Amino acid sequence: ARTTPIARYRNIGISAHIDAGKTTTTERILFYTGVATTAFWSGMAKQYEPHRINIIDTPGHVDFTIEVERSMRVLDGAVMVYCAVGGVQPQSETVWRQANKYKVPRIAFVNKMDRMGANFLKVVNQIKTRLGANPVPLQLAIGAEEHFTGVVDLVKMKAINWNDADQGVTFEYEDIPADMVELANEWHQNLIESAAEASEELMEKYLGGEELTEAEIKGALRQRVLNNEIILVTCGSAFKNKGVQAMLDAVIDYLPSPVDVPAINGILDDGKDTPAERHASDDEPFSALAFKIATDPFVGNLTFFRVYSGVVNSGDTVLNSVKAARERFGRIVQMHANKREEIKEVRAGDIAAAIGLKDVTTGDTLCDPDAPIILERMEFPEPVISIAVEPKTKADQEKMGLALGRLAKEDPSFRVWTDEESNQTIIAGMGELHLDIIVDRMKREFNVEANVGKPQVAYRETIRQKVTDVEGKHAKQSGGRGQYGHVVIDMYPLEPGSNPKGYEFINDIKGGVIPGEYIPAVDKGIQEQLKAGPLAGYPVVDMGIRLHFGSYHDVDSSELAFKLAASIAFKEGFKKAKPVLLEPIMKVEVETPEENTGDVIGDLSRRRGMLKGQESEVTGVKIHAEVPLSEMFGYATQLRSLTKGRASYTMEFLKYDEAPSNVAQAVIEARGK
Amino acid sequence: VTSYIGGEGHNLQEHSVILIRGGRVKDLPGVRYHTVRGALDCSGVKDRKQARSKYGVKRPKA
Amino acid sequence: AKKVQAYVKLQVAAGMANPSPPVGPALGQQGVNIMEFCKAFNAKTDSIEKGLPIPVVITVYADRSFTFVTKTPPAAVLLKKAAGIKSGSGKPNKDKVGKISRAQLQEIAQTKAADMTGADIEAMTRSIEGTARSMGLVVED
Ligand SMILES: CC(=O)O[C@H]1C[C@@]2(C)[C@@H](C[C@@H](O)[C@H]3[C@@]4(C)CC[C@@H](O)[C@@H](C)[C@@H]4CC[C@@]32C)/C1=C(\CCC=C(C)C)C(=O)O
Ligand SMILES: Nc1nc2c(ncn2[C@@H]2O[C@H](COP(=O)(O)OP(=O)(O)O)[C@@H](O)[C@H]2O)c(=O)[nH]1
Numbered sequence: 001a002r003t004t005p006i007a008r009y010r011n012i013g014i015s016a017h018i019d020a021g022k023t024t025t026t027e028r029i030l031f032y033t034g035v036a037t038t039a040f041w042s043g044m045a046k047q048y049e050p051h052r053i054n055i056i057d058t059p060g061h062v063d064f065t066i067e068v069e070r071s072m073r074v075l076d077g078a079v080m081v082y083c084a085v086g087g088v089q090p091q092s093e094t095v096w097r098q099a100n101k102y103k104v105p106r107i108a109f110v111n112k113m114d115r116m117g118a119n120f121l122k123v124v125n126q127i128k129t130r131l132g133a134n135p136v137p138l139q140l141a142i143g144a145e146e147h148f149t150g151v152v153d154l155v156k157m158k159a160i161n162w163n164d165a166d167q168g169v170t171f172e173y174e175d176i177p178a179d180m181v182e183l184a185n186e187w188h189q190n191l192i193e194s195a196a197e198a199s200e201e202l203m204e205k206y207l208g209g210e211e212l213t214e215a216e217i218k219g220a221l222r223q224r225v226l227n228n229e230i231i232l233v234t235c236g237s238a239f240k241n242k243g244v245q246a247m248l249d250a251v252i253d254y255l256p257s258p259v260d261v262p263a264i265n266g267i268l269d270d271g272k273d274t275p276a277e278r279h280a281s282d283d284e285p286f287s288a289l290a291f292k293i294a295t296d297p298f299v300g301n302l303t304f305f306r307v308y309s310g311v312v313n314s315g316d317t318v319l320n321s322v323k324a325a326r327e328r329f330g331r332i333v334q335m336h337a338n339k340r341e342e343i344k345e346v347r348a349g350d351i352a353a354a355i356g357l358k359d360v361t362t363g364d365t366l367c368d369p370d371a372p373i374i375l376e377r378m379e380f381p382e383p384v385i386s387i388a389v390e391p392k393t394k395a396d397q398e399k400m401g402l403a404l405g406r407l408a409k410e411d412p413s414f415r416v417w418t419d420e421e422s423n424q425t426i427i428a429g430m431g432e433l434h435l436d437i438i439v440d441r442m443k444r445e446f447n448v449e450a451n452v453g454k455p456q457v458a459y460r461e462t463i464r465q466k467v468t469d470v471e472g473k474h475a476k477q478s479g480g481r482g483q484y485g486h487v488v489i490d491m492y493p494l495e496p497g498s499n500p501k502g503y504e505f506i507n508d509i510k511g512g513v514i515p516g517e518y519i520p521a522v523d524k525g526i527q528e529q530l531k532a533g534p535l536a537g538y539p540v541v542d543m544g545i546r547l548h549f550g551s552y553h554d555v556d557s558s559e560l561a562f563k564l565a566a567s568i569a570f571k572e573g574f575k576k577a578k579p580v581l582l583e584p585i586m587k588v589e590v591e592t593p594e595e596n597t598g599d600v601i602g603d604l605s606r607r608r609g610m611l612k613g614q615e616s617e618v619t620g621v622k623i624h625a626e627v628p629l630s631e632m633f634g635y636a637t638q639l640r641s642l643t644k645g646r647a648s649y650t651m652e653f654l655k656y657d658e659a660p661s662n663v664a665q666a667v668i669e670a671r672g673k
Numbered sequence: 674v675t676s677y678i679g680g681e682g683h684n685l686q687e688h689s690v691i692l693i694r695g696g697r698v699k700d701l702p703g704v705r706y707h708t709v710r711g712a713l714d715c716s717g718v719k720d721r722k723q724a725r726s727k728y729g730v731k732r733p734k735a
Numbered sequence: 736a737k738k739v740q741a742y743v744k745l746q747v748a749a750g751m752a753n754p755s756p757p758v759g760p761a762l763g764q765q766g767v768n769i770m771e772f773c774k775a776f777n778a779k780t781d782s783i784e785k786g787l788p789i790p791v792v793i794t795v796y797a798d799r800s801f802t803f804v805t806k807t808p809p810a811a812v813l814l815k816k817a818a819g820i821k822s823g824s825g826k827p828n829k830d831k832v833g834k835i836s837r838a839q840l841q842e843i844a845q846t847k848a849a850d851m852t853g854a855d856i857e858a859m860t861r862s863i864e865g866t867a868r869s870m871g872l873v874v875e876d
Binding site for chain 1: 753755756757762763764765766769
């Protein structure tokens with residue numbers, strides 16, 4: 001029974017730079033349609049059969065662009081929202097590159113045409129010049145700012161005027177304003193020329209002076225959008241309510257259905273990585289991608305999944321091929337217009353959520369157990385900022401682990417580990433505003449009382465002076481039998497990192513002054529003292545010890561007596577050897593626009609960052625600097641402030657250098673206190 | 674109570690829902706309960722093909 | 736050539752490749768390609784001997800094309816070439832680095848009068864006398 005063709009499905013993302021107006025445009029959509037959300041659209045003139053629009057509203061911030069990446073990958077088409085005043089933003093370029101990576105056929109909506117400085121054609125030219133795109137206006141704005149009244153449809157060559165009294169639910173077709181007729185004819189010719197380029201037949205008609213029909217123009221522009229050759233540009237502004245309705249008609253006319261998109265690539269679970277495809281059909285084996293996990297207070301884990309092939313029912317044991325885990329599907333609803341119609345028939349093209357999946361993560365493939373496939377995996381970027389989180393109480397201690405676990409499950413770009421040296425819980429994320437939201441959820445949804453600090457710098461200990469002839473004599477001949485042990489050691493610094501063990505032991509015992517059986521106990525006594533340095537109780541590194549002189553007693557000498565002597569000798573020698581506190585240094589790489597370059601280093605200089613050099617790149621300059629871990633905290637948001645949000649840094653542990661005398665001494669004193 | 678960790682190397686991170694079973698080790702006074710290395714936070718332990726039921730390892734590949 | 740707004744005289748070498756990292760300086764608050772440079776220098780490299788950094792300019796025209804401004808291996812690195820002792824700068828007056836004859840520069844001043852442009856071959860000799868003592872040299876026949 002032919003019900004609603006999958007060719008009527010529009011799986012679309014609304015994507016924009018932070019602060020551009022995209023969910024208000026979506027709220028306008030829901031109002032006009034009748035209502036991840038499903039909506040139904042029949043056209044602003046009711047000229048279309050009912051189309052199913054599944055909308056994913058993607059975050060504007062770059063701290064949550066990981067969600068945008070997941071969405072873009074799982075979606076068919078996109079609506080790119082631009083501010084008429086601000087135009088193409090640095091963050092728009094990031095989202096634009098992500099949509100290019102996934103080859104998402106997309107259109108453009110120039111919103112905020114009611115604000116001061118609104119300029120449609122300026123934004124069209126910025127899409128061309130900054131994004132390297134081919135923008136083709138479908139519409140022209142009638143007026144600007146407070147004088148924005150409507151739009152010209154360049155396909156129909158008519159003005160669209162929306163009724164302000166019904167919030168734009170009704171519209172009239174008018175003749176083009178007399179001051180715009182010349183400009184409308186110019187852009188109509190540019191639109192027809194852009195349509196004619198879609199095929200040799202349409203190019204011949206156009207060059208022959210034959211007028212293209214509205215159906216040929218629409219079909220030709222659709223083909224090129226699907227090919228990602230052009231971007232169709234629409235305009236309009238809500239509040240007075242304009243554009244959205246005609247942008248929704250452009251979604252039907254020009255954006256892909258699930259059958260217009262290439263088959264999804266995957267790998268067979270045969271151990272040979274055999275390539276396979278899944279076509280957008282109900283008659284194919286079931287395959288779906290889990291793309292979002294949300295924690296719900298009432299139903300537990302919601303796993304959002306997009307079906308690409310086949311059909312599944314609410315309550316169907318499928319196979320999580322990625323995690324090799326048979327997962328019985330839970331309760332599955334669907335946002336049928338306003339209601340949440342529980343669907344027991346998730347067909348190809350549909351987006352739904354399952355309740356109570358246990359071993360499913362974002363990026364997992366859910367498939368038919370009799371036809372295993374792994375759909376292509378999501379690569380998750382490495383976290384760029386880390387902070388220490390400490391529980392206030394012991395109740396908060398266990399609760400913290402639980403809360404952070406849930407947050408790491410729903411958001412892979414969020415990492416949590418315990419630092420083995422500090423025993424602090426370290427959390428890491430895709431920016432500090434990202435970490436701020438994570439902390440807020442932890443101390444609200446889960447209400448876990450925690451302090452936010454900085455990852456403790458891994459302080460080390462070493463000497464800066466050879467000391468010779470250091471006597472250690474454990475002579476405890478008391479309490480029954482005596483315990484005699486006597487060693488003489490030299491202590492000397494090693495070059496930093498010259499020994500992968502951080503420690504050298506030289507046995508230079510001559511004359512059997514110490515029996516060879518006790519020499520391992522002396523070394524073990526030193527190695528235990530290396531774990532807790534005599535200066536501040538940090539591990540001692542980059543040190544050599546030569547045992548060359550010693551003495552035993554035939555009855556009273558013990559293995560651990562010589563280990564006690566070794567510790568005495570070590571503690572006395574270490575204090576004479578001018579002990580110092582060490583530091584880690586981090587190799588930092590910053591990618592920035594050439595005009596923002598200066599600011600980056602100004603701050604890095606205050607952060608004790610020894611700028612090694614620079615590699616002027618295409619974006620601008622790739623500056624390299626040696627910056628202490630202590631000064632590499634809170635840099636994500638600071639960089640975002642200096643560079644207006646167009647810079648990305650990386651950092652790696654470089655080497656164990658010497659902390660500046662001031663820094664080292666200050667910490668030594670604080671630790672002693 | 675104080676529990677005991679089986680196997681020879683765990684997968685622990687100090688906040689981990691682990692399961693408890695009876696049994697006194699006779700060697701640590703005050704440790705009276707074993708853990709299960711096959712249940713809920715301790716997976717099939719490393720490098721073992723015999724008595725797989727204890728320490729929870731599944732049967733090997735072939 | 737063009738205005739001094741697309742002016743950086745640079746290029747210590749050609750085989751070290753990229754003139755963007757430390758080796759090649761500048762490339763800051765200016766904006767231009769980097770591999771688009773040494774290809775015209777690749778038809779130009781094999782006349783210059785290495786160890787002799789030649790000053791050329793990234794002169795960018797108004798239509799995105801840029802080539803270089805050839806001015807011959809100069810005073811400083813030829814006294815690290817024709818004498819045989821490198822930079823060592825700072826000590827003209829402390830200890831003896833090297834004395835250079837009168838005619839040892841005049842034979843390469845004809846090459847250096849295509850590098851230096853005040854007027855003449857003889858007239859540029861007393862500025863080969865310049866940076867030599869800043870490198871630390873002394874000069875007498
Ligand atoms: C508009 C849109 O769709 O994104 C919204 C939706 C948003 C990504 C929200 C930020 C953040 O709570 C998000 C997390 C990770 C919060 C923790 C969990 O509950 C996740 C299951 C949840 C997913 C969606 C959600 C609720 C958004 C914002 C608005 C917050 C503004 C900022 C940056 C301070 C966003 O980042 O833009
Ligand atoms: N006047 C006017 N205001 C708008 C328009 N679109 C959005 N806004 C306002 O701008 C704000 C941002 O909208 P939102 O959709 O949250 O932006 P997003 O962050 O891009 O999703 C909202 O509070 C809206 O009231 C518009 O077309 N006209």
